Ligand binder design. Structure first.
Ligand SMILES: *[C@@H]1O[C@H](CO)[C@@H](O[C@@H]2O[C@H](CO)[C@@H](O)[C@H](O)[C@H]2NC(C)=O)[C@H](O)[C@H]1NC(C)=O
Ligand SMILES: *[C@@H]1O[C@H](CO)[C@@H](O[C@@H]2O[C@H](CO)[C@@H](O)[C@H](O)[C@H]2NC(C)=O)[C@H](O)[C@H]1NC(C)=O
Ligand SMILES: [Cl-]
Ligand SMILES: [Cu+2]
Ligand SMILES: [Cu+2]
Ligand SMILES: [Cu+2]
Ligand SMILES: [Cu+2]
Length: 497
């Protein structure tokens, strides 16, 4: 069952074996992935998060972010540790009480403390639209049509050795999959469809790192939503999905009754499908209970290319139709050296006092804010452009902005910008060497919004800045509850800070 929009959510430690290998984890709702949190557009979510964690090897503090939800007037509920709150300590709870006006689509939630979401605190978050303009394109849209793609590690996140390469040990589709080494024939996920029906498949990358080449043998996929933004229909036979992105696609159960492989090939870790790694099963009702015998093509006919996507609505692009054609045009210098990432020469290290609390306490320019050089002010009611030229090691980097979606004026692997009808989204691959992926948005949401690579290992290694949007109006726009004001004193006391 789905939970919410008003629910408790307990965060616990438990052993799990999603690929046949047992390890401890950090779980929401007792499962990996966590339960789907759901409601309708405009609803009031009240998610009372109970931190019941006791195993320090995965951190006993926590904080949860609701990825892609704008949090307008509720910046304090956004979740990034040391940006909008101090963490919740063990044995305490915290009510994330917010609204989702003007949004409907496929989102997710995850820990936003250190690399803790990699240890298991990740799940889907769906905001349905009772008047969805895409409703007539499908028959079924429910918990059974959510498809999560996850990387899974045998080594605990906090225990990844300094100086060794980090790669995953399994791809999990709907929480199940097989290990790349010492593969055992552990259970695969089954997605069941009925011949003749049409399904809104909600594809969610809950990855800490790899991008996936996602496909379904024998089928094609008609994209209708990108990171919460309705799209024109775009039929593809493969989707390269980067960490934290979402798509909805229509799956027409229009092939013979049978079993078909679902494929999710990560860019690192195990290559191929030997022993059923990187795989799940699409099973038609009435098919034999057996593995598919289908193959992929050698070359896909219609892979997703981001510039092919266009909004369903007339969203346009704010500003003027040329580089720098914005009120506040930025170009970030994104770099990596010696184990640390930097943005404009500064590697992100979380501050002691959350950025929001510093602002509420009267710090009122970005040069006043800690960490020094990591907080950039944005003016209110302005068109912002951010160019994100690639080249830093470890790419392709999926950059994500909290508090906002954005027009993708320039996409990976294509030097031509689009000032007319590009897709809007919230997480974008910045591509490869020489690319100049560029985003635009307007500043109508006062508060400090994190901008970072969503490869969690890279965030931990500093690949982030905070946009302090409309510092002057942050306090008036974001009244804070007493429980939020209590977080830092409790955290600092527990940690002898
Ligand atoms: C990416 O696009 C930005 C503009 O959006 C480019 O920025 C300009 O950079 C040059 C120096 O390289 C400066 O003289 C300009 O002031 C910048 N802004 C402009 C022209 O609008 C940037 O060079 C591009 N980067 C890459 C790698 O292509
Ligand atoms: C590279 O990106 C550009 C800009 O998004 C794409 O150009 C558009 O192509 C469509 C389809 O032919 C045309 O309707 C638009 O007028 C083009 N816009 C611009 C600004 O040129 C282009 O198709 C992309 N290249 C590839 C190979 O997909
Ligand atoms: Cl967000
Ligand atoms: Cu996220
Ligand atoms: Cu986010
Ligand atoms: Cu990265
Ligand atoms: Cu974030």
């Amino acid at each position: 069952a789905q939970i919410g929009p008003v629910t408790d959510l307990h965060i616990t430690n438990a052993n799990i074996s999603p690929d046949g290998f047992s390890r401890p984890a950090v779980l929401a709702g007792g499962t990996f992935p966590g339960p789907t949190i759901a409601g309708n557009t405009g609803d009031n979510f009240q998610i009372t998060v109970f931190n019941d964690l006791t195993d320090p090897s995965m951190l006993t503090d926590t904080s949860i972010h609701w990825h892609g939800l704008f949090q307008k007037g509720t910046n304090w509920a956004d979740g990034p540790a040391f940006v909008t709150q101090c963490p919740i300590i063990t044995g305490q709870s915290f009510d994330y009480n917010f609204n989702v006006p003007g949004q409907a689509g496929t989102f997710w939630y995850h820990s936003h403390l250190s690399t803790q979401y990699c240890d298991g605190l990740r799940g889907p978050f769906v905001v349905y639209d009772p008047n969805d303009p895409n409703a007539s394109l499908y028959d079924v849209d429910d918990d059974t049509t959510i498809i999560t793609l996850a990387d899974w590690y045998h080594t605990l996140a906090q225990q990844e050795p300094i100086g060794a390469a980090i790669t995953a040990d399994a791809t999990l589709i709907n929480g199940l999959g097989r290990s790349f080494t010492n593969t055992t024939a552990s259970p695969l996920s089954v997605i069941t469809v009925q011949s003749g029906k049409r399904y809104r498949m909600r594809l969610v990358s809950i990855s800490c790192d790899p991008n996936y080449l996602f496909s379904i043998d024998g089928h094609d996929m008609t994209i209708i939503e990108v990171d919460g933004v309705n799209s024109q229909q775009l039929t593809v036979d493969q989707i390269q999905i980067f960490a934290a992105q979402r798509y909805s696609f229509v799956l027409n159960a229009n092939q013979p009754v049978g079993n078909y492989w679902i494929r999710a090939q990560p860019n690192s870790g195990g290559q191929g499908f030997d022993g059923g790694i990187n795989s799940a099963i699409l099973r038609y009702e009435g098919a034999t209970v057996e593995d598919p015998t289908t193959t992929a093509p050698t070359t896909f006919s219609n892979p997703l290319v981001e510039t092919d996507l266009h909004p369903l609505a007339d969203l346009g692009v704010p500003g003027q139709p040329f580089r720098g054609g914005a009120d506040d045009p930025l170009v970030l210098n994104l770099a990596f050296a010696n184990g640390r990432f930097s943005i404009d020469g500064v590697s992100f290290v979380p501050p002691t006092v959350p950025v929001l609390l510093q602002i509420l306490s009267g710090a009122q320019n970005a040069q006043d804010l800690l960490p020094a050089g990591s907080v950039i002010s944005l003016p209110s009611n302005s068109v912002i452009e951010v160019a994100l030229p690639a080249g830093a090691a470890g790419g392709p980097h999926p950059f994500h902005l909290h508090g906002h979606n954005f027009a993708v004026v320039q996409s990976a692997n294509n030097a031509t910008p689009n000032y007319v009808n590009p897709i809007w989204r919230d997480t974008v691959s910045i591509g490869g060497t020489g690319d100049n992926v560029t985003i635009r948005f307007t500043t109508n949401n006062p508060g400090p919004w994190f901008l970072h690579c969503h490869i969690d290992w890279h965030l931990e290694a500093g690949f982030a800045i905070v946009f302090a949007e409309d510092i002057p109006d942050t306090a008036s726009a974001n009244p804070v509850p007493q429980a939020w004001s209590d977080l830092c004193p409790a955290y600092d006391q527990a940690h002898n800070i």
